[PDB]
Amino acid sequence: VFKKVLLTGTSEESFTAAADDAIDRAEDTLDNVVWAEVVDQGVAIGAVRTYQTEVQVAFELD
Amino acid sequence: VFKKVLLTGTSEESFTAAADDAIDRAEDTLDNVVWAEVVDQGVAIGAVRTYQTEVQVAFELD
Amino acid sequence: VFKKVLLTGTSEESFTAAADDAIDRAEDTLDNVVWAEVVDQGVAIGAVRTYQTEVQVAFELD
Amino acid sequence: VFKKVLLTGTSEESFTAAADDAIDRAEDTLDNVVWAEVVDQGVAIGAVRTYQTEVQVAFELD
Amino acid sequence: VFKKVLLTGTSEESFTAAADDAIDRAEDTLDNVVWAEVVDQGVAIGAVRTYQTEVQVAFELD
Amino acid sequence: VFKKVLLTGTSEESFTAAADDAIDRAEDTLDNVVWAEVVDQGVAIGAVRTYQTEVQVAFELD
Amino acid sequence: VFKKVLLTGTSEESFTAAADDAIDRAEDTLDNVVWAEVVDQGVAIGAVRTYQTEVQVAFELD
Amino acid sequence: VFKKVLLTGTSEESFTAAADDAIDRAEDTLDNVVWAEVVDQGVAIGAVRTYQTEVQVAFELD
Amino acid sequence: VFKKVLLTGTSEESFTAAADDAIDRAEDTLDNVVWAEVVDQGVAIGAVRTYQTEVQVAFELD
Amino acid sequence: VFKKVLLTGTSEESFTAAADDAIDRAEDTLDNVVWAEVVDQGVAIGAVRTYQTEVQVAFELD
Amino acid sequence: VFKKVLLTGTSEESFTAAADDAIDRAEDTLDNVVWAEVVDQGVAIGAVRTYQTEVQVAFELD
Amino acid sequence: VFKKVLLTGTSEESFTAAADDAIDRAEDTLDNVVWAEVVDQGVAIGAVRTYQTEVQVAFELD
Ligand SMILES: Cc1cc2nc3c(=O)[nH]c(=O)nc-3n(CCCNC(=O)O)c2cc1C
Ligand SMILES: Cc1cc2nc3c(=O)[nH]c(=O)nc-3n(CCCNC(=O)O)c2cc1C
Ligand SMILES: Cc1cc2nc3c(=O)[nH]c(=O)nc-3n(CCCNC(=O)O)c2cc1C
Ligand SMILES: Cc1cc2nc3c(=O)[nH]c(=O)nc-3n(CCCNC(=O)O)c2cc1C
Ligand SMILES: Cc1cc2nc3c(=O)[nH]c(=O)nc-3n(CCCNC(=O)O)c2cc1C
Ligand SMILES: Cc1cc2nc3c(=O)[nH]c(=O)nc-3n(CCCNC(=O)O)c2cc1C
Ligand SMILES: Cc1cc2nc3c(=O)[nH]c(=O)nc-3n(CCCNC(=O)O)c2cc1C
Ligand SMILES: Cc1cc2nc3c(=O)[nH]c(=O)nc-3n(CCCNC(=O)O)c2cc1C
Ligand SMILES: Cc1cc2nc3c(=O)[nH]c(=O)nc-3n(CCCNC(=O)O)c2cc1C
Ligand SMILES: Cc1cc2nc3c(=O)[nH]c(=O)nc-3n(CCCNC(=O)O)c2cc1C
Ligand SMILES: Cc1cc2nc3c(=O)[nH]c(=O)nc-3n(CCCNC(=O)O)c2cc1C
Ligand SMILES: Cc1cc2nc3c(=O)[nH]c(=O)nc-3n(CCCNC(=O)O)c2cc1C
Ligand SMILES: [Cl-]
Ligand SMILES: [Cl-]
Ligand SMILES: [Cl-]
Ligand SMILES: [Cl-]
Ligand SMILES: [Mg+2]
Ligand SMILES: [Mg+2]
Ligand SMILES: [Mg+2]
Ligand SMILES: [Mg+2]
Ligand SMILES: [Mg+2]
Ligand SMILES: [Mg+2]
Ligand SMILES: [Mg+2]
Ligand SMILES: [Mg+2]
Ligand SMILES: [Mg+2]
Ligand SMILES: [Mg+2]
Ligand SMILES: [Mg+2]
Ligand SMILES: [Mg+2]
Ligand code: NA
Ligand code: NA
Ligand code: NA
Ligand code: NA
Ligand code: NA
Ligand code: NA
Ligand code: NA
Ligand code: NA
Ligand code: NA
Ligand code: NA
Ligand code: NA
Ligand code: NA
Ligand code: NA
Ligand code: NA
Ligand code: NA
Ligand code: NA
């Protein structure tokens, strides 16, 4: 059985690095992370631009 | 990194109060709740009407 | 077996009351109404504002 | 011909009043506003809760 | 309040049995499981075919 | 001209048999049923599991 | 309250005339038809081409 | 950079001519109109039928 | 088994004729074309307007 | 690089077997088939019922 | 109240830089730009590749 | 007439380079490639991360 968590990664560099920010957090706290699907992307526009990529990160349960 | 939980709040008064029911539960159990996005709304029709609002409630991890 | 009818309720007060307007019409004419799912919401803007909530109203056949 | 603007209204009371906040802004600046369609709803969760309703507000050109 | 987890069940027999695989895992670890909604279905095609059914499994919190 | 009714069939065996439950009800009450399109699938989880398949069932008018 | 029926009109001439085929059927059998929304379009390709336009046709109840 | 405006053209003849009604309005008021994407189609059913086609009309900024 | 190809037909006359442009190309090169489903429509706006209709054209394999 | 073909499998038994009908056709004609994603399901209702499952079948190019 | 404009940024380097191209144009002409949501991405394939990212860019009115 | 193929490009560097991986494969085997539309993005998480971008790559037939 796989389960997915819905995470939004951030980066001041690019949408790819914001996806990796989420995946790095998932791998810090979960075992058997196996893939991620991008569900939304956006940019927070303040003092700097922060690219955000929301991913469903799938991991295998057990 | 933000994470979202998918909660359905209920109310016998209105869709806004059913969104707040979910958010109040998230704030009981999670720190750093920052926003909610409505994903579905419906009404359970029994002895009384129960308005339901499903929200993805985002909180900042750490 | 359940069947759904696609109704748009109206109210000059709120989206929740326009959902209830549709459900009240369904319960006038159908037996065994059991739930409603909101599919669209809008506002007709004329002499007054009329909030509209479109619902699929499910009822059990028999 | 109708044209739509994509506005997000806010309210600390309810999703219906946040839709009306957007419509009131459209009617301040545009003539012949004729309807609004809700496209998204959410809640900003800070010191207080601010309900937000995003609407495409249609007005007739001429 | 209900909460949903996003699980992908697997089966080498059918999409219905892969939905039940997810639900059986949810019932192993959560109380008050009340319904599941199918969100995606697919087949992993290797040495054998593994049917997969992804479900949001809802359970009542408390 | 074809018209569609939105029915949810149920079965304690499988999603295919819950689609057939809806179609059997449509054929009991309507003439010239010609096809069905699956629009949603889910499982009610109580004393037993009840698989549900919602279909738009098309029939030719006349 | 408005209710919608889901009809597929046909024409061997064009998608506009297949929408009108559905609307003409609705007006034959229902009072107070007020608008139609196109939901799908397609072409049946046999001895001749038959353009099809599926519409939700709204009528006011009473 | 391109920008899109969301316009609904009307015609008593056909959906193609209602798309052209919107595009003709865009070309009256904007320079460098380059394409349009159909996003919705419908028919207003009153004394006469008025076909409507909503388009995002893209134009190049500068 | 049916297979679909994703084609965009063009016409300087109408969206129906741009669907037929795609279907005519499919019938030039494939046997047993049986139906087409419209998936997108748009207009290229240059020296002239070119209406485009994208269709999934289904044909039976064998 | 993976490429997907859009196939509709059929079966008089079940939606799972109609997915396998498509996959069996893909494996007859393509090398390195690796997965399939269900995109639509329906039932053709004639002398018998024919369950149909449309899948995007992915295969690795080379 | 926030309003969004629908802009397509371009870059010959990457999808992130094409999002920034749109945002830079919005900040040239609008005050109080606060966020952008990616709605579509594509690549124009001519003499060179031009990555395009379409964003709804939100700004606060006043 | 344009036709689209549905390809998933891969890269261990970024989503933009995985889109270019698909486009480079299309240009190896097809003439008159003219644009690509991103339809899905994801990351395969194994020994290394492999970013994947699925594109519909359009080419002009003739
Ligand atoms: C993708 C994205 C979506 C957002 N949507 C909203 C929104 O819907 N409402 C709101 O008050 N603030 C929002 N915000 C917050 C704006 C806060 N201010 C800022 O970024 O300068 C959003 C931010 C991001 C990055
Ligand atoms: C939004 C909403 C959706 C529902 N969908 C279903 C459903 O798909 N199937 C079912 O057996 N019961 C359902 N139910 C449960 C009906 C249970 N009875 C009742 O509300 O009187 C649903 C209830 C709600 C509020
Ligand atoms: C949600 C909503 C959607 C509408 N869409 C349309 C529409 O697409 N076209 C049209 O002529 N009139 C429309 N109308 C009717 C405008 C009629 N005039 C008015 O409300 O002052 C719509 C009305 C509502 C409430
Ligand atoms: C509907 C809604 C969506 C939002 N989405 C985002 C978002 O995607 N990213 C972000 O940094 N901040 C967001 N925000 C901003 C969070 C800012 N903080 C706060 O509300 O306490 C969003 C706010 C709202 C109301
Ligand atoms: C529904 C489904 C979707 C998949 N999507 C992908 C995918 O997008 N990319 C990838 O490298 N592998 C995938 N895979 C993994 C292919 C691994 N190999 C195999 O199944 O023989 C997917 C598998 C399944 C069952
Ligand atoms: C597909 C499906 C969707 C449902 N959605 C809801 C729902 O949104 N809210 C609710 O109160 N009950 C629901 N229910 C009813 C739960 C009633 N209890 C039970 O099944 O043990 C749903 C049931 C089904 C089968
Ligand atoms: C829009 C459209 C969709 C169709 N989809 C299907 C379909 O999914 N399966 C099937 O067996 N036949 C279909 N058909 C029926 C093909 C019957 N034969 C024919 O048109 O020569 C469809 C027909 C139309 C017009
Ligand atoms: C596509 C379309 C959508 C519409 N949707 C609505 C609607 O949602 N609510 C409403 O009061 N009136 C509507 N109307 C207005 C009906 C006004 N009366 C009429 O057309 O005779 C709509 C009109 C059109 C053309
Ligand atoms: C439906 C449609 C969509 C289009 N989308 C795009 C697009 O997203 N980006 C771009 O550079 N050019 C586009 N184009 C090309 C504009 C080329 N110039 C012209 O039509 O005068 C599109 C054209 C059409 C017909
Ligand atoms: C899923 C499915 C969708 C279909 N959609 C259509 C359709 O949109 N129009 C049409 O003329 N025939 C259709 N058909 C064909 C009906 C042909 N007759 C029959 O099945 O007895 C469809 C068939 C299937 C299985
Ligand atoms: C994302 C994207 C979408 C496009 N869609 C279309 C389209 O639908 N029709 C058309 O004639 N040209 C198009 N074009 C224009 C092709 C113009 N030629 C070229 O890019 O070499 C599109 C271009 C882009 C970048
Ligand atoms: C976007 C993406 C989607 C995937 N979806 C699935 C999936 O739905 N089921 C499965 O068994 N494997 C999958 N996989 C395969 C996991 C194989 N293992 C791995 O990547 O370590 C997917 C892979 C990718 C990149
Ligand atoms: Cl989710
Ligand atoms: Cl419906
Ligand atoms: Cl828009
Ligand atoms: Cl496709
Ligand atoms: Mg930096
Ligand atoms: Mg009360
Ligand atoms: Mg009042
Ligand atoms: Mg207050
Ligand atoms: Mg076995
Ligand atoms: Mg049994
Ligand atoms: Mg003729
Ligand atoms: Mg006339
Ligand atoms: Mg001409
Ligand atoms: Mg049999
Ligand atoms: Mg360069
Ligand atoms: Mg590297
Ligand atoms: Na989730
Ligand atoms: Na988002
Ligand atoms: Na729901
Ligand atoms: Na219906
Ligand atoms: Na509507
Ligand atoms: Na939003
Ligand atoms: Na999936
Ligand atoms: Na459902
Ligand atoms: Na259809
Ligand atoms: Na807009
Ligand atoms: Na519309
Ligand atoms: Na398109
Ligand atoms: Na289909
Ligand atoms: Na686009
Ligand atoms: Na395809
Ligand atoms: Na995918």
- DSSP class of residue A42 equals E
> String of b and e for H13-43 (b: at least 16 CB within 10 Å)?
ebbbbbbbbbbebbeeeeeebebbbbbebbb
Is I62 in contact with I2 (CB distance < 8 Å)?
A: no
**DSSP calls for C2-61:** EEEEEEEEEESS-HHHHHHHHHHHHHHH-S-EEEEEEEEEEEEESSSEEEEEEEEEEEE-
For chain H, breaks with the C atom over 2.5 A from the next N come after none
Residues 6+ away with beta carbon under 8 Å from F39: F6, F54, F55, F56
Per the CB < 8 A criterion, the answer to whether E36 and E22 are in contact is yes
CB I50 within 8 A of CB I10: yes
Closest CA to C59 of F25, B47, B45, F49: B45
CA distance H16 to H51: 9
Q: Helix (H, G, I), strand (E, B), or coil: what is residue A7?
A: strand
Q: How far apart are CA H15 and CA H41, in angstroms?
A: 7
- Yes or no: say if B58 and B22 are a contact pair by the CB < 8 Å rule: no
| DSSP assignments along chain D, one per residue | -EEEEEEEEEESS-HHHHHHHHHHHHHHH-S-EEEEEEEEEEEEESSSEEEEEEEEEEEE--
Resolution in A: 1.6
d(CA I37, CA I11): 17
Q: For residue F3, how far is the Cα from the chain centroid?
A: 15
Integer-rounded Cα Rg, in Å, for chain L is: 12
How many other C-beta atoms can be found within 10 angstroms of the C-beta atom of residue H11? 19
* Residues in a beta bridge with C8: C54, G2
Structure tokens at C36: 């409603």
CB-nearest to E56 from B6, B21, B22 is B6
State whether C15 and D19 contact (CB < 8 Å). yes
Q: What share of chain F is helix, strand, coil (3-state, %, to 5)?
A: 25, 55, 20
Question: Measuring from atom 1 of ligand 8, which residue has the nearest CA?
Answer: H42
Q: From C54, B20, B26, select the one nearest D15 (Cα to Cα).
A: B20
| Pairwise CA distance, residues L37 & C21, whole Å | 43
Determine the Cα–Cα distance for residues A43 and K35; give it in Å rounded to an integer. 6
Nearest to G40 by CA among F39, F8, D46, J34: F39
**Chain D contact for H23 (CB, 8 A cutoff):** no
Nearest CA in chain L to I55: L3
Element (H, E) at F24: helix F15-29
C-beta of residue H33 within 8 angstroms of C-beta of residue H23:
yes
Taking the C-alpha atoms of residue A8 and residue A54, their distance in angstroms, rounded to an integer, is 4
Which residues, at least 6 apart from F28, have a Cβ–Cβ distance to it below 8 Å? none
Give the domains, in start order, of chain L with CATH numbers: 1-62 (3.30.1660.10)
Report d(CA K50, CA K47) in Å as an integer.
9
Between β-strands E2-11 and C2-11, what pairing exists: parallel, antiparallel or unpaired?
unpaired
* Residue C9 forms contact with G (CB below 8 Å): yes
Among residues H56, A51, L56, which one has the least CA distance to residue K15?
A51
Task: Give the three-class secondary structure for A43.
Answer: strand
CA angle centred on F7, ends F2 and F10, rounded to 5° = 145
All residues of chain G having their beta carbon less than 8 Å from the beta carbon of residue C5 are 3
A7 close contact with L: CB closer than 8 A: no
Q: Tokens 């690095």 identify what position?
A: A17
Two tokens, residue D49: 């809760």
Q: Is C49 left (phi over 0), alpha (psi -120 to 50) or beta?
A: beta
Q: Which of H5, B10, H51, I29 is nearest to K5 (CA)?
A: H5
I/A Cβ contact: 3+ pairs below 8 Å: no
| Count of alpha carbons within 13 angstroms of residue L5, beta-carbon side | 24
Residues shown for chain G: 62
Cα of first residue to Cα of last residue in chain D, in angstroms, is 8
Q: Which amino acid type is present at position J31? A: D
- Ligand 7: which of G52, G54, G55 to mutate, most ligand atoms within 8 Å of CB? G52
Alpha-carbon gap, residue A53 to K28, rounded angstroms: 25
Which candidate, K13, K37, K12, places its Cα nearest to that of K23? Answer: K37
What is the Cα–Cα distance from C43 to B27, expressed in whole angstroms? 32
The count of C-alpha atoms lying within 13 angstroms of the C-alpha of A18, restricted to the half-sphere facing its C-beta, is 26
Token pair of H62 as six digits? 């500068």
Provide CB contacts within 8 A for G49, sequence distance 6+: G12, G43, I20, I23
How close are the terminal C-alpha atoms of chain A, in Å?
A: 8
Q: Which residues pair with H60 in a beta bridge?
A: H2
* Tokens describing residue D16: 């219906």
Subunits touching E (CB < 8 Å, at least 3 pairs)? A, B, F, J
Between CA G46 and CA G55, with CA G52 as vertex, the angle to 5 degrees is: 160
3-class DSSP assignment, residue L52: strand
> Which helix (H) or strand (E) is I22 found in, with range?
helix I15-29
Question: Locate tokens 């289904």: which residue?
Answer: I58
Residues whose CB falls within 8 Å of the CB of residue D36, separated by 6 or more in sequence, listed in order: C42, C43, C45, D19, D22, D23, D26, D55, D56, D57, D58
Q: Would you call C48 an interface residue with chain F, using a CB distance cutoff of 8 Å? A: no
Q: Say if residues E26 and E7 touch (Cβ distance below 8 Å).
A: yes
- Report the Cα–Cα distance between both ends of chain F, in Å, rounded: 8
DSSP H/E element including I36: strand I33-45
Contact G29, G45 (CB under 8 A): no
**Ligand 9 in contact with K42 (CB < 6 A)?**
yes
* Residues of chain I contacting residue G15, judged by C-beta atoms under 8 Å apart: 15-16, 19, 38
Partners of C52 in the β-ladder: C10, C42
CA dist., res. L9 & res. L22, Å (int): 4
Q: Which amino acid is at I46?
A: G
Element (H, E) at E27: helix E15-29
Residue D24 Cα distances to A33, E38, J37, K58, angstroms: 48, 40, 46, 18
- For residue K40, which ligand has an atom nearest its CA? 42
Contact residues for K26 (Cβ-Cβ < 8 A; gap 6+): K5, K7, K33, K36, K57, K59
Minimal Cα–Cα distance from E46 to chain B, Å?
33
To the question of whether residue I33 is assigned a binding role by annotation, the answer is no
Return the structure tokens found at L39.
């339809």
Structure tokens at B57: 């409630």
Distance CA F34, CA F43 (A): 26
What's CA G32's distance to the chain center, in Å?
A: 15
Residues of D in contact with C51 (CB under 8 A): 16, 19
Q: Are strands J2-11 and J49-60 parallel, antiparallel or unpaired?
A: antiparallel
Closest CA relative to residue F41, chosen from I44, E53, E14:
E53
Q: Choose among F40, F45, F51: nearest Cβ to E16.
A: F51
The answer, yes or no, to whether any atom of ligand 6 lies below 6 A from the CB of F42, is yes
Residue G60 has a CB neighbour count (10 Å cut-off) of: 13
Structure tokens at D6: 């994509």
Residue D10 and residue D50 in contact, taking contact as beta carbons nearer than 8 Å: yes
How many Å apart are CA G34 and CA G2, to the nearest integer? Answer: 9
Binding site annotation covers G5?
Answer: no
Rounded CA gap, K43 and L55, in Å? Answer: 9
From CA B20, how far away is CA B38, in angstroms rounded? Answer: 11
Element (H, E) at B19: helix B15-29
CA A4 to chain centre: 11
SS3 label, residue G23: helix
Question: How far is residue A41's CA from residue K38's CA, in Å, rounded to a whole number?
Answer: 5
Contacts of J27 in chain I (CB under 8 A): none
Q: From the CA of B5, how many Å to the nearest CA of chain A?
A: 8
Comparing alpha-carbon positions, the chain G residue that sits nearest to I13 is G14
Long-range contacts of I22-31 (CB under 8 A, 24+ apart): I22/I53, I22/I54, I22/I55, I22/I57, I22/L1, I23/G43, I23/G45, I23/G49, I23/I55, I23/I57, I25/L1, I25/L61, I26/I57, I26/I59, I27/G45, I30/I5, I30/I57, I30/I59, I31/I59
Give CA–CA dist G29/G37, Å, rounded.
18
Helix (H, G, I), strand (E, B) or coil at L35: strand
J61: exposed, middle or buried (Cβ count in 10 Å: 0-12, 13-18, 19+)? middle
Q: Are K6 and K52 in contact (CB under 8 A)?
A: no
Dihedral of the alpha carbons of H5, H6, H12, H13, in degrees to the nearest 10? 70
Q: How was this structure determined?
A: X-ray
How would DSSP label each residue in K10-32? EESS-HHHHHHHHHHHHHHH-S-
Chain I hits for L2, Cβ within 8 Å: 7-8
Beta strands in chain B (DSSP E): 2-11, 33-45, 49-60
Find out whether C6 and G56 touch, Cβ atoms under 8 Å.
yes
Helices assigned H by DSSP within chain L: 15-29
Q: Do G15 and I19 touch (CB under 8 A)?
A: yes
Cα distances (angstroms) measured from residue I3 to each of D55, I9, I58, J26, L59: 39, 18, 5, 10, 19
Query: What are residue C18's phi and psi, to 5 degrees?
Result: -70, -35
Any bridge partners for residue B41, and if so which?
B53
